[PDB]
Write an enzyme that holds these catalytic residues in place. Structure first.
Site, PDB file in Angstrom:
ATOM      1  N   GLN A  26       0.817  -1.209   0.000  1.00 48.75           N
ATOM      2  CA  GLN A  26       0.000   0.000   0.000  1.00 48.75           C
ATOM      3  C   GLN A  26       0.854   1.263   0.000  1.00 48.75           C
ATOM      4  OE1 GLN A  26      -3.255  -0.138   2.826  1.00 48.75           O
ATOM      5  NE2 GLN A  26      -4.014  -2.111   2.040  1.00 48.75           N
TER       6      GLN A  26
ATOM      7  N   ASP B  17       0.142   0.599   8.896  1.00 45.66           N
ATOM      8  CA  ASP B  17      -1.036   0.129   8.122  1.00 45.66           C
ATOM      9  C   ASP B  17      -0.971   0.400   6.602  1.00 45.66           C
ATOM     10  OD1 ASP B  17      -3.454  -0.995   7.464  1.00 45.66           O
ATOM     11  OD2 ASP B  17      -4.702   0.453   8.533  1.00 45.66           O
TER      12      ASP B  17
ATOM     13  N   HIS C 164      -8.449  -7.525  11.749  1.00 50.01           N
ATOM     14  CA  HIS C 164      -9.037  -6.179  11.642  1.00 50.01           C
ATOM     15  C   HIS C 164     -10.410  -6.261  12.287  1.00 50.01           C
ATOM     16  CE1 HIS C 164      -6.786  -5.604   7.612  1.00 50.01           C
ATOM     17  NE2 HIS C 164      -6.355  -4.613   8.368  1.00 50.01           N
TER      18      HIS C 164
ATOM     19  N   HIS D  61      -7.341  -1.727  14.835  1.00 48.20           N
ATOM     20  CA  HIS D  61      -8.278  -0.597  14.844  1.00 48.20           C
ATOM     21  C   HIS D  61      -9.162  -0.598  16.089  1.00 48.20           C
ATOM     22  CE1 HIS D  61      -6.690   0.062  10.903  1.00 48.20           C
ATOM     23  NE2 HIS D  61      -7.282  -1.009  10.400  1.00 48.20           N
TER      24      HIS D  61
ATOM     25  N   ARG E 198     -11.096   1.823  -0.882  1.00 51.02           N
ATOM     26  CA  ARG E 198     -10.757   0.400  -0.939  1.00 51.02           C
ATOM     27  C   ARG E 198     -10.770  -0.137  -2.375  1.00 51.02           C
ATOM     28  NH1 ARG E 198     -13.692  -4.784   1.826  1.00 51.02           N
ATOM     29  NH2 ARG E 198     -15.062  -4.425   0.011  1.00 51.02           N
TER      30      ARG E 198
ATOM     31  N   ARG F  19     -15.822  -9.804   8.274  1.00 47.54           N
ATOM     32  CA  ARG F  19     -16.483  -9.741   6.972  1.00 47.54           C
ATOM     33  C   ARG F  19     -15.934 -10.816   6.035  1.00 47.54           C
ATOM     34  NH1 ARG F  19     -13.934  -5.457   5.275  1.00 47.54           N
ATOM     35  NH2 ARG F  19     -12.990  -5.061   7.331  1.00 47.54           N
TER      36      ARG F  19
HETATM   37  N1  LIG Z   1      -7.747   0.177   6.424  1.00 43.35           N
HETATM   38  C1  LIG Z   1      -8.320  -0.939   6.026  1.00 43.35           C
HETATM   39  N2  LIG Z   1      -7.621  -1.709   5.041  1.00 43.35           N
HETATM   40  C2  LIG Z   1      -8.203  -3.025   4.893  1.00 43.35           C
HETATM   41  C3  LIG Z   1      -9.525  -2.953   4.183  1.00 43.35           C
HETATM   42  C4  LIG Z   1     -10.596  -3.863   4.683  1.00 43.35           C
HETATM   43  O1  LIG Z   1     -10.692  -4.084   5.923  1.00 43.35           O
HETATM   44  O2  LIG Z   1     -11.396  -4.416   3.876  1.00 43.35           O
HETATM   45  C5  LIG Z   1      -7.251  -3.856   4.094  1.00 43.35           C
HETATM   46  O3  LIG Z   1      -6.170  -3.349   3.676  1.00 43.35           O
HETATM   47  O4  LIG Z   1      -7.513  -5.059   3.835  1.00 43.35           O
HETATM   48 ZN   LIG Z   2      -4.910  -3.041   7.864  1.00 46.34          ZN
END
Ligand SMILES: N=CN[C@@H](CC(=O)O)C(=O)O
Ligand SMILES: [Zn+2]
Ligand SMILES: N=CN[C@@H](CC(=O)O)C(=O)O
Ligand SMILES: [Hg+2]
Ligand SMILES: [Hg+2]
Ligand SMILES: [Hg+2]
Ligand SMILES: [Hg+2]
Ligand SMILES: [Hg+2]
Ligand SMILES: [Hg+2]
Ligand SMILES: [Zn+2]
Lengths: 451, 451
Positions: free
Chosen positions: A60, A319, A231, A268, A81, A208
């Site tokens: 990222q 992150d 998360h 988080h 996202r 999720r």
């Molecule tokens: N800040 C969140 N990032 C998450 C997004 C997610 O939870 O779907 C991720 O990189 O997978």
């Molecule tokens: Zn993350």
């Protein structure tokens, strides 16, 4: 080897004239305050334990800052996202390794001495597995080794697009494994990570992305020696959907269905109500707070003061890597509480009124716990991971003890970190990393390829 | 003299291969894009107009970060202020000059090319005037000259401890002037400031510190061409007390009783209700937002999105100088809006979806307006104040135009500012200021004397 510090932060507090003996394997073997140097190396400034970075998605960093374009009057976490998904769809194994190398070098320069890589990019461009299914995990490990940063690799179980075992979306194709394949990958990684001196952890992307059944299966699979990361409760939508599917909030659900304990890092945990905060603190799990990313993504402000008051444990993670700064994360952890409460001096302990020291002590301990590594303090039998601040800096040179931490964390910045040691090896000297030129050249080429 | 930028941010937008001719007086004489170098000095990266810093109290940098110690369970702005008063009580003219020079050097290195010094330390330790009443104002000017930073001096009218003309406290004794002495000071300052190429503005500390008659008197004194600055609506207690004394809120009161217009800079304006925000935007006054200090002091979050949407003008100031970073102020101006709204991409224009460019455009314009200097724009006739970003930085080198501003402001930091020019003179080169060593030596000694 040995080093000698005029000033160092030890577990019992600030000490003077400390001689550290470091074993051949990079472990602190003797620590003598008020000592003579006795042949040890002269250090150039105040010495602190290095800061663990308890949450990273390395790739990222390649898009950091690029998602700051309004495309809608109410741009959301979810539209961010989708852009992130478009980035990840393009990455080769070679690009992933290059990005990780550059990122970890930058982390080291900021004072992050070890990282938990929450790694969910597993497969090839069409979602098909690599010839070696661990291919991308191994690139991460090779990158950490080249930079010289500590590493806990967290291969991520990711199976679904939403609660109820919703089928994965096309954009998630590179992340997807079932429980069985995930447990195979995990077992496959033990030997190569061990050979590199790296650590491993169990990881569920989020509530999720995996089902309750999968969580139960993985937790019963016999990897009890590993940290567990997830998360959780980052965005209000997750809270609402959890309620719709279970009649509970996300943290509430987890605590009701899973034996959450000190092995756990809850990343988080932003939307934690008072009962959820209390349950977290009781359990000894670590809140993985990613302040710069949470602000960037508009997640909200964690109830850190309530959590800390009840003995909560926390650490910091970069992150999405819009920021790579121990200073920024700790400063704005505190400042966010100040902005919410409209008061000053929010995060302190009953036995420690100094804000900077409170923050540093907290994140050291939580970071070490979340990574499952013997770090987070300068004690005999812990790994020699440390920073040396600028002894020539007029603010730091005029300060003593915890005031020095306040000058750095609240009035100073990243470039006050001068030298960095990880596993008893010097990896940053005078703000520079031996591999920075090669890495920058490779990295700029990759950035070009990604446009 | 002549310089050449491969990339530069001009009033009409990003341009390529721009040749700048700078006259002997430091004014931009000629600017043409798509040009040849022709012996002009080739610059090392992207060129931007330098950022004005529209609010400073120089001496506060000496205590920056030191007030982060919990004394009370609910530490406040007011307990901070008492600590600040204790610091100011110790400062000699020499110490003030030393701190100001060091601070201004650090500002320059951050990319601030001009500063508005909201200067309220006037008299000796016992509150008695110096032989030359302007002594400390002159020290500020001398310091700005030594550092090479642009300067709008705002000598401050400060007369009372609170609404209703409450007698000044003992802690405020160094700040105090009646209207007559203040108006004399303004006249005394005109010639030396002009001789140094510096500017002057009118300034009331706050509605707590001066009376309505004093405001009217000063405004009737004929200095109709000068900027007018005031702290306003920073803290809830000021709102409550203003309501008690006038039946109005502070901003409401000012707009009801004074012809506020484009000359004005309203510093903080944090507690602005929707009607107050609308009146500010309508008036064309500049909101002087000091994000790091407002967070540090727990003031709260300004309604920047509502203000901007209505044509509001703003700039940034470092204020108490816990932070000296254009990046940090602009980044957290936006992040504060994101945390409040729990959404992304908050500050943009109808004609500019890029967040970084919106922020930079805005603060350049508001900052130049608030200082009353011909800056904030790379156009012929404007002063040659500019910064050069790092052209060797892989993030910046791989980016173009507005995306480059996003990489810097949201993914990068101060270290990417490499060269800084003010009034056509290079004051920072490759991150270094010529006076930095002498300055730090003097400054560390002053820091020792202040403990
Ligand atoms: N800040 C969140 N990032 C998450 C997004 C997610 O939870 O779907 C991720 O990189 O997978
Ligand atoms: Zn993350
Ligand atoms: N951030 C606020 N500082 C103000 C305090 C005040 O308004 O009394 C000042 O330095 O004068
Ligand atoms: Hg690499
Ligand atoms: Hg590398
Ligand atoms: Hg749920
Ligand atoms: Hg000076
Ligand atoms: Hg100086
Ligand atoms: Hg009032
Ligand atoms: Zn101020």
């Amino acid at each position: 080897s040995a080093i000698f510090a005029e000033r160092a932060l030890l577990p019992e507090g600030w000490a003077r004239n400390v001689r550290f003996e470091i074993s051949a394997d990079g472990v602190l073997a003797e620590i003598r305050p008020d000592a003579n140097a006795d042949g040890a190396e002269r250090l150039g400034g105040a010495v602190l334990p290095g800061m663990p970075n308890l949450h990273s998605h390395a790739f990222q960093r390649a898009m950091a800052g690029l998602a700051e374009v309004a495309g809608n009057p109410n741009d959301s976490f979810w539209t961010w996202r989708e852009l992130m998904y478009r980035m990840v769809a393009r990455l080769s194994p070679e690009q992933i390794e290059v990005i990780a190398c550059q990122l970890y070098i930058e982390m080291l320069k900021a004072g992050y001495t070890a990282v938990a890589e929450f790694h969910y990019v597993h497969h090839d461009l069409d979602g098909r597995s690599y010839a070696d299914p661990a291919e991308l995990s191994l690139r991460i490990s090779r990158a950490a080794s080249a930079a010289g940063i500590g590493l806990t690799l967290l291969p991520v179980l990711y199976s679904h697009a939403g609660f109820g075992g919703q089928p994965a979306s096309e954009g998630q194709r590179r992340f997807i494994n079932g429980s069985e394949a995930y447990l195979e990958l995990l077992q496959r990684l033990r030997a190569p990570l061990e050979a590199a001196g790296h650590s491993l952890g169990l990881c569920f992307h989020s509530l999720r992305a995996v089902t309750p059944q999968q969580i139960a299966t993985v937790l019963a699979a016999g990897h009890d020696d590993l940290p567990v990361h997830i998360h959780i409760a980052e965005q209000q939508k997750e809270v609402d959907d959890c309620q719709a599917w279970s009649g509970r909030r996300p943290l509430q659900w987890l605590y009701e269905n899973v034996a959450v304990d000190q092995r756990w890092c809850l990343v988080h945990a932003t939307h934690a109500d008072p009962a959820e905060v209390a349950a977290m603190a009781r359990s000894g799990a670590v809140a993985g707070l990613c302040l710069s990313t949470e602000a960037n993504l508009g997640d909200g402000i964690f109830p850190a003061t309530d959590f800390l008051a009840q003995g909560g444990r926390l650490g910091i993670g970069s992150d999405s890597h819009v920021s790579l700064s121990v200073v920024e994360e700790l400063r704005w952890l505190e400042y966010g509480q100040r902005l919410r409460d409209r008061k000053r001096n929010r995060l302190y302990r009953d036995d420690q009124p100094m804000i900077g020291r409170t923050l540093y002590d907290a994140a050291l301990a939580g970071g070490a716990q979340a990574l499952g590594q013997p770090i987070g303090s300068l004690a005999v039998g812990r790994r020699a991971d440390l920073l040396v601040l600028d002894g020539n800096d007029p603010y730091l040179a005029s300060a003593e003890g915890d005031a020095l931490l306040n000058r750095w964390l609240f009035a100073g910045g990243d470039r006050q970190v001068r030298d960095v040691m990880v596993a008893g090896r010097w990896v940053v000297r005078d703000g520079r990393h031996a591999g920075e030129e090669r890495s920058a050249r490779a990295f700029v080429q990759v950035l070009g390829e990604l446009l």
